[PDB]
Paper text:
To further investigate the mechanism of C–S cleavage by [name], we determined the crystal structure of isethionate-bound [name] at 2.4 Å. The P21 crystals contain four monomers per asymmetric unit, each exhibiting a canonical β/α barrel fold common to other GREs. The sulfonate group of isethionate is coordinated by Arg187, Gln191, and Arg676 of [name] and one water molecule through an extensive hydrogen bond network. The conformation of isethionate is further stabilized by van der waals contact with Phe680, Ile190, and Thr310. The three sulfonate-coordinating residues (Arg187, Gln191, and Arg676) are conserved in the sequences within the “[name]” cluster of the GRE SSN, but are absent in CutC and other GREs, supporting the proposal that the “[name]” cluster enzymes are involved in sulfonate degradation. Despite overall structural similarities between [name] and CutC, two substrate-interacting loops (loop A and B) in [name] are shifted by up to 6.8 Å relative to CutC, resulting in dramatic changes to the binding pocket structure and substrate-coordinating residues. The orientation of the isethionate C2 and sulfonate-leaving group differs greatly from choline in CutC. A 98.5° rotation of the C1–C2 axis in isethionate vs. choline results in the pro-R hydrogen of isethionate being oriented for abstraction by the thiyl radical. Incubation of activated [name] with isethionate resulted in its conversion to acetaldehyde and sulfite.
Author numbering:
A (entry chain B), B (entry chain A): 31 to 828
């Protein structure tokens, strides 16, 4: 059924598809000078008319952005200058490799790359950064490799995570969006330069893009119909005919049944992939809510069954599992180990009126996740103080499957923060999970720019080596904070750290200022803009830097929180306060990676650590967090946004660690940094509840300039076994909620399974582990990232 | 000790003191034409120089606003036109009578009244309301009596509740404030008219009022020294010397000890009473926080003891119990049965950084309340999702004393609402309870105008009688919505009610627009403004309508929620859907107050009722609430404020009830309406937990335009007996917090105690009951308010 589809692409390397990039380029190279949203819309039409449409074997819904099997899509507007080396490197890349046929290689070199030579966003961004910033961003003059210090993330995705107002599609259809746009055009003053230049072309872009997705849908209806006529098996012939009927109706017209709603949404989400490379892949919204009217009505009218609806969802996810986010740059790839994806599916939470939103579909999605073997969908469960008992129990049972699903997002942290930044309560209460851990208001959010990922572990190294890093030798990178062995008090060391920290923040905000102004000259999002109230009201593409009435919620990342906290905690305690070792002795111990210095290494590992509800380390964490909250509060208004400190790592803590030498917390050189706001590996020796408490102690709830923190916690199977274990997990989630923590997600595994899977990859090919907001096959992960997963403390008693 | 003090005025009618009114008037009549804040400051200086200062027997702190015993104060600027009848009527008034000596009456007629003739705020407001509004406001052309329909509340208190930044006094002292203002004057441009007219006179008033309270304090220090020098008892002589020393220092200078902090805060609190008639009497803030540093240091340094500190607290509250809020108009008196008072004292909650704020002083205040027999202080305990267990347990034990202490205010409802209205998280988290149930940010709140109390039970009556009310005969009051016996569907009845409801809202908002602009011409508050950051920054008196950067949080009252919901529920169910009776039968039964129609009365009492978690009624309640939230959201911006629906009754449900005839829910003519957002009398038949859910069901969490709801619940002693009963209350409080409800407070009493005390007041004269955010002696209450307290369901289980 779905296992039949699943057997068809099992254990196959994804291929790179080129049709979208080819026809995008054929259109774009013919429209130079025209308004970018209009060019994008004409290209989407050109794609809609010329790219291959697929009706896939055994499927009940149709729509692809690429070829049979697992595939990815090319985005030359973003990083087309990487196409040459991606041809050479992608098939053999150690992590997340992609195969490329010779035929598709020829189109890239011959039909795609030439136009984009000298026109990509990454070429423009590399030239746009001033030298002081460039040295902290890239390792070479053409910005082909990051230095993993002040890491910009705008050059390996079109935008950050996004959630469409899919329900708008289901209720109105794209023909309705188009007619609104025509009426708006008719109301313009034809004498007005602003109407003629700022209003008309945007609205014309909306009209075309509506015609584009509809024409694309109707080409499926035709293909399905032609197949139905030649189909000999009656059962399949009725299904093909059903496809021809539904796709002739949606997404042009509002959906009439649950099946149409799935296909309408599926069409919208696939075309979204064709339009742009959304960060983490475009997300899916509160499906258990906006599907509910269709599900409820069909269920009552015998049109659908509990099993039949569950079959259609599985049809949707096997398709999602065939689309792989393609990162052709080495920075993008190392941020996204194991074919990383986060097409967040939100279930549960509250309605816009503050009532609990659990419905039967909520439980179906949970069950759907528990019985679909792939690590799809990216299930995110909303928690609030009145989350029902049965719901939390079912959340706990899903967690105890061991695959890491679902991740938990806390209404009690998001809703107050979002109303404090201008959201009506209805908008905040109705938020969707997006990407790793983010909250989105699909008609109020307007910010789309990838933000800095900052390796603050390197900032600490630059204190130890007075502006330099061992990885980069004598390169003049950071502030000349002075010879650390010349510091007489702890306060001088801390100030040294503070100076490096503000240098990185300062660097990052200059990056974002340039990025936010630059992106609008390279990226447009006409289909996404047509589903956004403010875009339509003010005639502005989503990627415009400022949109009236919008709220801009963006990010800068703190990487290595636990690593830095413990290192600083050790230095303060062991070097300055207890004077158990001198600065030179510590530095000497670091310089030789503790080889021959195992005694100091153990001594350093004995100081107070983050994640133990220990105020000695937790006060250091709070002061480090305060630096980023207060910086954001002060300097974000200049950028017309909320640029908030966030602790969501992707898989960057691996490459960020690969460039940071041995640190005062006892961590070995070049190994992964601590993840998100989790405790540093094996530093939580007081149980799992103290991790939640240290996360609380390390925040600054007196100010609003904060976003998510990603928290990874691992239980052993014994610790959560049985009804008593389910009750503990449920209660632990209630405490997480009460503490106003943003996110939590769990692995449930024995250490020996991870070790065995390293010692025998072929045997444990299907082992799935939760990494950072997503799950992947353990055997696809690099040794360094495996070591991150292994060294995470497994809690046995909770 | 304090029992000796309390024995001296036990069971005595308070007297009306005139000194403040005399010396206020002597100054004001000499300063006509000057800017009002400067005049007020000069008036307060004149009082400071001429009014009697008292060193009271057995006391350890000093400061009075009137004569020995229980006393009240006159504020002729507010309602001086009532002085004539207050001379005749107050000593014999049935509720809350005040005695007045013949000499004090002579001061009033001869030295106070003449100047204020034609100058009072009430005279000005009465003339300023247009005829359409006046008919709904007052029952006579000089506005001497309310009609208890659209009741304005600005005319019987200077302002609404208020909380000073007392901690600023303790930490800075008033000399610092004066010096700040002097520098600000020195920095002015002497050529600038705006500096000369808008800045200098405001700052000159701050200088004077700082000198005024300091001079007033030093006269206490002088008198105490003179008494100590003649004191024969060594113990008492030391107390006088301590008083002489402490009062020469505070509030001029920052406090140095716990004793000084109490005396400084007391001075500020008493002088505030001299400055104006704050609503509910000025409130006291989070004393367990800003007293904590002094308590901890002295306690550690052997300077203070738990018992001595508790003694100093009791000295403050016996003083508070001697100050009685004086309402001379009959409206003010009927709103404030039994000498109602709400000098809110806030304990517990969260710090400005979101950490739990329980400390040892928090528990001492609880113990302090449990061992002081009077219904003082007005203890308010803040609740949040992390209220500690021991804290909730001691709160429950205090509740189990049966006196109504403490009232519960829920962070989880207040804090999101306040940051959504512009408060930083630190300001919101640090809020103080003020008055009945309100939250105050002492340097961000700027709104001070009394709002409407709207008798929506009367609005329903105008549907039953097509714009008229039985109490007022043929007086053409409301909208002519038609003969109710002509309504063919429920929707017509509902629409008629909606029309009257909006008439009352429109009326109240015209009142507030006129009131908010009028008050600045009659009231000024120099001492309160000198403690407010925004006042000092922008040189504006607190009672200015608009103050830059301020947040204006005001109110309009819905009275009779339960009464109206159930009446409508009965009409919807019994007349229109089940057709168990005709409209003519219901009206006939109502007009004769059910006499001869007892069966109809019984049938009407059987419909679904609010407070039972019954969506049939709760959905009506939710829709009525939505009417007022949506109206406020739309039309408050015009007023430059948040004019939010609130359900806090004072004791106005008695006078509001006394003008409403028999209602469709079975309530008898002229009896009390339901209180706050509590269930209507005896309508809650499904336990106390369903009241909380119905309060939740009847709200609209999707919008912010909402303020407090006062909730009264009564348990019998049996329900809460023993350790299990304490745990049940703790558990019930968690559910109250989880549901984001604003307020709850409890009576614990047997119905028979209420009946026995009615049949024999002398025997049960000291019985204390929780009424509406405050507690009072049951025997001081009118029969109508006693019947309200008796009819509240006493719950045996939860």
């Amino acid at each position: 059924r779905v296992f039949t589809i699943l057997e068809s692409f099992d254990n196959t390397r994804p291929r790179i598809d080129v049709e979208r990039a080819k026809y995008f380029t054929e259109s774009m190279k013919a429209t130079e000078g025209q308004p970018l949203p209009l060019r994008w819309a004409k290209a989407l039409m050109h794609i809609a008319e010329n790219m291959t449409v697929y009706i896939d074997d055994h499927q009940l819904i149709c729509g692809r952005a690429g070829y049979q099997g697992r595939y990815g899509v090319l985005y030359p507007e973003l990083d087309g200058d990487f196409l040459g080396t991606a041809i050479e490197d992608l098939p053999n890349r150690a992590e997340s490799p992609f195969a490329i046929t010779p035929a598709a290689a020829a189109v890239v070199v011959e039909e795609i790359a030439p136009f984009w030579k000298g026109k990509t966003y990454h070429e423009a961004l590399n030239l746009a950064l001033p030298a002081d910033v460039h040295k902290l961003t890239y390792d070479d003059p053409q910005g082909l490799m990051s230095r993993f210090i002040v890491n910009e993330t705008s050059s390996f995705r079109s935008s950050i995570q996004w959630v469409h107002d899919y329900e708008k599609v289901l209720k109105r259809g794209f023909r309705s969006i188009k007619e609104e746009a025509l009426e708006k055009i008719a109301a313009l003053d034809p004498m007005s330069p602003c109407d003629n230049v700022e209003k008309r072309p945007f609205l014309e872009a909306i009209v075309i893009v509506c015609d584009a997705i509809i024409l694309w849908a109707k080409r499926h209806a035709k293909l399905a119909a032609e197949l139905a006529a030649k189909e000999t098996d009656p059962t399949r012939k009725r299904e093909l005919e059903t496809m021809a009927e539904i796709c002739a109706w949606v997404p042009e017209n509002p959906a009439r049944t649950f099946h149409e709603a799935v296909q309408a949404q599926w069409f919208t989400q696939v075309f979204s992939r064709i339009e742009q490379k959304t960060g983490t892949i475009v997300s899916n919204g509160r499906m258990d809510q906006y599907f509910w009217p269709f599900y409820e009505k069909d269920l009552a009218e015998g049109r659908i069954t509990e099993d039949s609806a569950l079959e259609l969802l599985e049809c949707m996810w096997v398709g999602m599992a065939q689309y792989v986010d393609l990162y052709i740059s080495p920075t993008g790839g190392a941020f996204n180990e194991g074919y990383a994806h986060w097409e967040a599916v939100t279930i549960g939470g509250q309605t816009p009126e503050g009532r609990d939103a659990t419905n039967d579909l909520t439980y179906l999605f949970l069950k759907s996740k528990r019985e679909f073997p792939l690590h799809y969908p990216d299930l995110a469960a909303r928690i609030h103080s009145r989350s029902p008992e049965r719901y939390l129990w079912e959340v706990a049972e899903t967690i105890k499957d061991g695959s890491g699903f679902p991740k938990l997002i806390n209404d009690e942290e998001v809703v107050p923060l979002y109303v404090s930044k201008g959201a009506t309560f209805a908008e905040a209460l109705d938020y969707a999970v997006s990407g790793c851990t983010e909250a989105r208001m699909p008609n109020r959010d307007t910010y789309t720019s990838g933000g800095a990922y900052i390796n603050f572990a390197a900032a600490l190294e630059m204190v130890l080596y007075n502006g330099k890093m061992l990885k980069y030798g004598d390169t003049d990178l950071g502030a000349h904070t002075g010879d650390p062995c010349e510091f007489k008090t702890w306060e001088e060391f801390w100030n040294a750290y503070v100076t490096q920290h503000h240098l990185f923040l300062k660097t990052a905000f200059v990056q974002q200022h340039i990025i936010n102004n630059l992106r609008a000259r390279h990226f447009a999002q006409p289909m996404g803009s047509s589903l956004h109230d403010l875009c339509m009201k003010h005639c502005l593409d989503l990627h415009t830097p400022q949109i009236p009435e919008g709220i801009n919620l963006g990010y800068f990342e703190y990487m290595g929180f636990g690593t830095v906290v413990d290192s600083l905690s050790a230095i303060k305690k062991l070097v300055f306060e207890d004077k158990k070792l001198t600065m030179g002795e510590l530095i000497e111990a670091l310089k030789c990676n503790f080889e021959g210095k195992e005694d100091i290494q153990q001594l350093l590992k004995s100081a107070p650590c983050y994640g133990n509800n220990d105020d000695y380390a937790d006060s250091i964490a709070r002061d480090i967090d305060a630096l980023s909250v207060k910086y954001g509060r002060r300097y974000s208004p200049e950028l017309g946004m909320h640029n908030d400190v966030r602790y969501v790592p992707f898989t960057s803590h691996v490459p960020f660690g690969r460039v940071v030498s041995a640190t005062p917390n006892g961590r070995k050189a070049w190994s992964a940094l601590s993840d998100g706001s989790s405790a540093s590996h094996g530093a939580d020796v007081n149980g799992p509840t103290a991790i939640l408490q240290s996360n609380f102690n390390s925040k600054n709830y007196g100010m609003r300039d904060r976003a998510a923190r990603m928290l990874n916690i691992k239980f052993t199977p014994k610790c959560v076994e049985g009804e008593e274990g389910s009750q503990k997990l449920v209660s632990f989630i209630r405490t997480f909620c009460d503490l106003k923590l943003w996110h939590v997600q769990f692995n449930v595994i024995n250490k020996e399974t991870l070790l065995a899977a390293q010692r025998d990859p072929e045997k444990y090919r299907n082992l799935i582990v939760r990494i950072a907001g997503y799950s992947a096959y353990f055997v696809d992960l690099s040794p360094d990232l495996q070591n991150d997963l292994i060294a995470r403390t497994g809690h046995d008693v909770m």
